[PDB]
Each structure stands twice: as C-alpha cells, then as structure tokens.
Amino acid sequence: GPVWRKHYITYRINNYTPDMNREDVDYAIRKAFQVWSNVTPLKFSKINTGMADILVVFARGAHGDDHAFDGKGGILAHAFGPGSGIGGDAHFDEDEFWTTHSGGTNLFLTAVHEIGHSLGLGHSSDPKAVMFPTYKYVDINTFRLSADDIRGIQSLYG
Numbered sequence: 379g380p381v382w383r384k385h386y387i388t389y390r391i392n393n394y395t396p397d398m399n400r401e402d403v404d405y406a407i408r409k410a411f412q413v414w415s416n417v418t419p420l421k422f423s424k425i426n427t428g429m430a431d432i433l434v435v436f437a438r439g440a441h442g443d444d445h446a447f448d449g450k451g452g453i454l455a456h457a458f459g460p461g462s463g464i465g466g467d468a469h470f471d472e473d474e475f476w477t478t479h480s481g482g483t484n485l486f487l488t489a490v491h492e493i494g495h496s497l498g499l500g501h502s503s504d505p506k507a508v509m510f511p512t513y514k515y516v517d518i519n520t521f522r523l524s525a526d527d528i529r530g531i532q533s534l535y536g
C-alpha cells in the first residue's frame with residue numbers, strides 16, 4: 379500500500395482528551411512515534427500550527443470522516459494510511475478513557491498501533507504484535523515491538 383516518500387514526518391495534536399494531563403498526551407504520542415523511528419529512517423516532529431502529515435485527533439461518534447466511533451469499548455481508534463489530507467491521520471475515540479497506565483485504554487500503546495497504520499502497516503495475525511487488531515495492555519515501560527512488527531515496518535521503510 380501507500381508509504382511516506384520522505385523521512386521527515388510531522389504530526390500535530392489537533393485537540394487533547396480531557397482524560398489525561400496535557401503533558402502526558404504529548405509524551406505518550408511522542409513516545410509512540412519514537413517506537414517507529416527507532417526501527418526506520420523516519421524522523422517525527424511535533425508541530426503546533428499548520429498542516430502536519432499526521433493529525434492526531436480525539437473525537438467521538440460521527441466525526442467527519444466516514445468512520446464513526448462506537449462509544450466506549452469496541453473500536454478504540456483508527457488511522458489512515460499515508461496520503462494527502464486525511465491520509466496519515468490518527469483518530470482516538472474520546473468515548474474511551476485514555477490513560478498513561480494499565481487502567482482505561484493506554485494511549486501510548488494504542489498510538490503505537492495507530493501510527494503503524496499512519497505509516498502504512500496493516501494488521502498482524504500474531505497476538506504478540508502491536509499491530510494485532512486486539513488491544514492488550516503490556517507494561518509500557520518495558521514495551522518492545524514484536525519481530526513481526528519490525529519485519530512489517532521494515533518491509534515498508536529502510
């Protein structure tokens with residue numbers, strides 16, 4: 379599928395979930411990007427104005443793309459593959475309760491997965507992979523991509 383054809387990728391946090399401290403949203407997203415820049419040539423930078431490649435949005439229900447959220451549970455987030463406009467963008471369902479920890483839905487872990495999509499990955503069938511469809515909390519402080527994820531992203535970049 380589509381991939382970014384440049385190494386410097388920008389993201390912008392469109393709006394912040396009230397579920398978390400602002401700085402914790404910033405950090406979770408930053409760290410999630412780092413997971414992927416760790417294993418590719420990509421460089422991610424947060425911008426605070428203008429058009430980013432990857433717009434990070436918190437929204438609930440119907441939110442202006444064709445892909446409505448479903449309230450608490452079920453779909454946690456979704457993201458568009460590389461492309462102009464909505465391409466790359468990552469949307470997080472505000473009806474989830476986002477956290478820094480194992481309570482609610484961990485934003486960092488979810489963002490790692492979604493950013494995978496923003497970079498052009500699809501889902502893995504391996505339950506060990508962050509790109510497995512199903513959210514499962516794993517210790518975020520010890521988090522590592524599965525070999526499956528690394529193989530996936532290194533099939534696209536590098």
Ligand SMILES: [Ca+2]
Nearest residue numbers: 431463465466
């Ligand atoms: Ca975009």
Ligand SMILES: [Ca+2]
Nearest residue numbers: 449451453471
């Ligand atoms: Ca949901």
Ligand SMILES: [Ca+2]
Nearest residue numbers: 397472474475
């Ligand atoms: Ca929420």
Ligand SMILES: [Zn+2]
Nearest residue numbers: 441443445469
């Ligand atoms: Zn959306």
Ligand SMILES: [Zn+2]
Nearest residue numbers: 491495501511
């Ligand atoms: Zn997914």
